[PDB]
Design a protein around this ligand. Structure first.
Ligand code: NA
Length: 181
């Protein structure tokens, strides 16, 4: 409906660990905003099935985090593979943003892009090569006027959709708090 090459694709992944060569994607979510950060549509929220041997690579931090959130139980119950998750996500995105136009948007989104390169290259290809990393702005604010950061709080639940929603809210806060455009 509001299909435009100015729209922004927001994405978050949850993984069994930090190393793309070793670990696996267990959840994915996407959100599309317009260029002014108004949320236009939320994409598929997909817990991706992984066998126990892949879940068994998780360290204590990932095990407790993803178990307490209910994600591990959703992963075990899920019947959706990476390729099906890719198919679902691309069928969503093609309705809102053309291929190759939106930078990848999120918090420390470079780490997610590594997992996309390795495990979902067809989806990585959908993004423009640039990055919109909200944590870049967080870091500069911490150094230039850290007191600003006390006016914003994150829950940080590691549920992919809630975490992207918090990323958009964080950038919305910065536009009023540290930007003048
Ligand atoms: Na993340």
């Amino acid at each position: 409906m509001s299909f435009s090459d100015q729209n922004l694709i927001w994405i978050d992944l949850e993984m069994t660990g930090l190393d793309p060569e070793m670990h696996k994607i267990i959840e994915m979510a996407t959100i599309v905003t317009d260029s002014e950060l108004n949320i236009l549509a939320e994409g598929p929220v997909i817990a991706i099935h992984q066998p126990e041997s892949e879940l068994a690579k998780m360290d204590e931090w990932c095990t407790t985090t993803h178990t307490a959130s209910g994600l591990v139980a959703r992963v075990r119950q899920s019947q959706v593979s990476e390729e099906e998750a890719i198919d679902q996500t691309l069928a969503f995105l093609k309705q809102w943003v053309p291929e190759g136009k939106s930078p990848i948007c999120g918090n420390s989104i470079g780490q997610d892009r590594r997992f996309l390169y390795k495990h979902m290259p067809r989806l990585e290809a959908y993004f423009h090569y640039r990055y919109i990393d909200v944590s870049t702005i967080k870091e500069l604010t911490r150094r230039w006027q850290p007191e600003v950061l006390k006016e914003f709080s994150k829950t940080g639940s590691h549920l992919a959709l809630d975490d992207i929603r918090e990323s958009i809210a964080e950038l919305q806060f910065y536009r009023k708090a540290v930007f003048k455009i």
